[PDB]
Amino acid sequence: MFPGSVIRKLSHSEEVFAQYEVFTSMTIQLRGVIDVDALSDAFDALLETHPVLASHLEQSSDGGWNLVADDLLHSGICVIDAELRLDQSVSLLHLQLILREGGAELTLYLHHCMADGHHGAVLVDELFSRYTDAVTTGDPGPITPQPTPLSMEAVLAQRGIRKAERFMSVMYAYPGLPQAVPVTRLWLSKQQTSDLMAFGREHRLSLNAVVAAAILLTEWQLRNTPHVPIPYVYPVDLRFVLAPPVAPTEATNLLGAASYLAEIGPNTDIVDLASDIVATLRADLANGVIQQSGLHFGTAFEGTPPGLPPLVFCTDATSFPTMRTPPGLEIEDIKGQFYCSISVPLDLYSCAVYAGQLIIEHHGHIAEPGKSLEAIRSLLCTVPSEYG
Numbered sequence: 001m002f003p004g005s006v007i008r009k010l011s012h013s014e015e016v017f018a019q020y021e022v023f024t025s026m027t028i029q030l031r032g033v034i035d036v037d038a039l040s041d042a043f044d045a046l047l048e049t050h051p052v053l054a055s056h057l058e059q060s061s062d063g064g065w066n067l068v069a070d071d072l073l074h075s076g077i078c079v080i081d082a083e084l085r086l087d088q089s090v091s092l093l094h095l096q097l098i099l100r101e102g103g104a105e106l107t108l109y110l111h112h113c114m115a116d117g118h119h120g121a122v123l124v125d126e127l128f129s130r131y132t133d134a135v136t137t138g139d140p141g142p143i144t145p146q147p148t149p150l151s152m153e154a155v156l157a158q159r160g161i162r163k164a165e166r167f168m169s170v171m172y173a174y175p176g177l178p179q180a181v182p183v184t185r186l187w188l189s190k191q192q193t194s195d196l197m198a199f200g201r202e203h204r205l206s207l208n209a210v211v212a213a214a215i216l217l218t219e220w221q222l223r224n225t226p227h228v229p230i231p232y233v234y235p236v237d238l239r240f241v242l243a244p245p246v247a248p249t250e251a252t253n254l255l256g257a258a259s260y261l262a263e264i265g266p267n268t269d270i271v272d273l274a275s276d277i278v279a280t281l282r283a284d285l286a287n288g289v290i291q292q293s294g295l296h297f298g299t300a301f302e303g304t305p306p307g308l309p310p311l312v313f314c315t316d317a318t319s320f321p322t323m324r325t326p327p328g329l330e331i332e333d334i335k336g337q338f339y340c341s342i343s344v345p346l347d348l349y350s351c352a353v354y355a356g357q358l359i360i361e362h363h364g365h366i367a368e369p370g371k372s373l374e375a376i377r378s379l380l381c382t383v384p385s386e387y388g
Contacts (some may be wrong), residue, residue: 003071007055010065010113011151015251015299017112017171018057018065021175021341024110025119026124031103032329035135039106040077042130043095045140046123047072050249052148053114057088068111085376086178086339094129103332106167109339116253116297117317119235121251125323132324150251152238152296153304159243165293166259167231172307175341183337184369186377188358192384196358200386203271206280207358208316210292211351211380213274218375219312220264231311232277234262235297236290256285257295262312271385284344303345310347 001007004109010018047053054075058066080098092111098104108127110120130140152167156162188196200207212234219230235255239246245253260280262273284290298317304311334354340346346364353359358380362373 003069005069007052007067007069009060010057010067011153011252013152013296013298014113014293015065015298016301017051017253018059018088019175020301020344021086021088021091021178021339022112022301022344023178023339024112024115024120025107025337026110026120027105027107027125027331027333027335027337028128028283028331029105029335030329031332034097034099034104034106034329036079036097038134038140039097039131042127042134042140044072044075045130045134045143046127047075047076047093048143049126050123050149051145053093053110056090056092057111057113058231063174065113070234086151088175099325103329105232105347112253112298112338114149115249116237116255117235117315117319118239118255119248119252121248121317121319132326133285135326146249148185149249150246152251152254153294155238155242155246155251155254161292164257164259164295165289166261167308170229170231170308174309178339178341181338181340181344181346182365182369182374183335184362185335186360186370186373187241188360188377188380190356192381193356194359194365195352195384196380199387203274205271205274208318208351209274209278209355210270210378211316211358211360212277212314213270214376214379214383215314215349215372216262216273216312217264217268217270218372219310221375222372224309225267228309230262230264231309232314233257233297233300233311234260234314234316236281236285238291241285241291242298253296253298256290256293257297257299258290259295270387297350300348301340301344301346303347312349313347314351317350320352320354331337 052071055067055069058068060066077095077097086109092114096107096108106123134140200210216230236258238254258281260277300313332358348363350361360373360376362369
């Protein structure tokens with residue numbers, strides 16, 4: 001509504017991101033001439049299509065958080081040639097362009113209470129779609145403003161759905177200024193990827209499916225604790241699962257959480273593990289466990305709960321291709337990073353295939369960041385060659 005007025009209170013599912021001042025960034029390394037004027041038009045046009053982004057959070061007397069509306073007259077790009085303070089109470093979106101040699105660095109900051117990976121990616125893609133239309137044409141494209149995207153509990157309420165479920169047995173058995181989260185990243189040669197892929201569909205599996213196995217195996221090899229299970233959790237976009245489908249910007253965060261207690265022994269086989277995981281998902285979907293369980297992937301930012309072995313979180317956020325860029329500009333790299341407030345127990349893995357190259361990542365304040373990532377690294381290059 002009018003700036004200063006309350007848009008809506010955040011849903012319990014969204015509060016995680018407010019409680020840990022979680023912000024998500026997306027940086028595109030560029031090469032070429034950035035027509036800043038046109039870029040600013042695209043950013044302004046985008047904001048008019050998603051007027052919610054023009055707000056901030058205010059913790060209500062009732063312990064909850066209010067999404068309060070702001071004005072769009074203040075939100076503009078920020079060109080440069082840390083130097084920045086992300087603050088929930090102030091803004092939830094920041095477009096930072098840093099000019100460089102051949103190309104500059106485009107970086108979008110988005111508070112996670114307004115979008116999960118999918119919703120955000122769609123925005124990032126919209127931005128570049130408008131820039132291309134802004135440079136190609138004098139117009140960044142038509143603007144049709146959308147209403148306040150729904151919270152997950154809102155989406156379920158519209159449907160029947162009124163209102164962990166596997167880690168109960170292993171139970172007790174066996175936000176000031178935000179700071180960047182350390183992020184380690186390892187790549188794979190165009191070839192090594194193709195090798196892992198070929199090995200993939202040569203077992204009725206997928207990169208993501210295998211990758212998780214590799215991650216889960218390694219976790220055991222370094223846990224220095226045998227026979228102790230490894231609780232696994234990953235995101236599931238309920239947008240293609242639920243009743244009338246939900247569109248990416250239609251909801252804030254609609255990523256369900258799929259649990260899976262991996263029990264790796266010294267003989268456990270990659271495909272064996274990979275396939276069991278994939279199958280369990282299907283069983284849960286078929287039983288409506290994922291749809292009806294209030295579990296969301298935001299829980300990832302809450303680390304491991306009491307009385308439970310270290311949870312392994314991994315997001316299959318492989319994406320960002322087919323992204324429009326006018327003639328003369330080209331994307332050289334796309335890195336994602338979080339900026340939750342210090343002390344966030346964020347232990348998370350992630351992967352994606354960029355330019356036909358698999359990219360492994362480990363996020364969070366952890367000792368020997370590239371330790372497991374490397375163990376997992378060589379493991380994804382071994383399995384495809386020597387399996388028989």
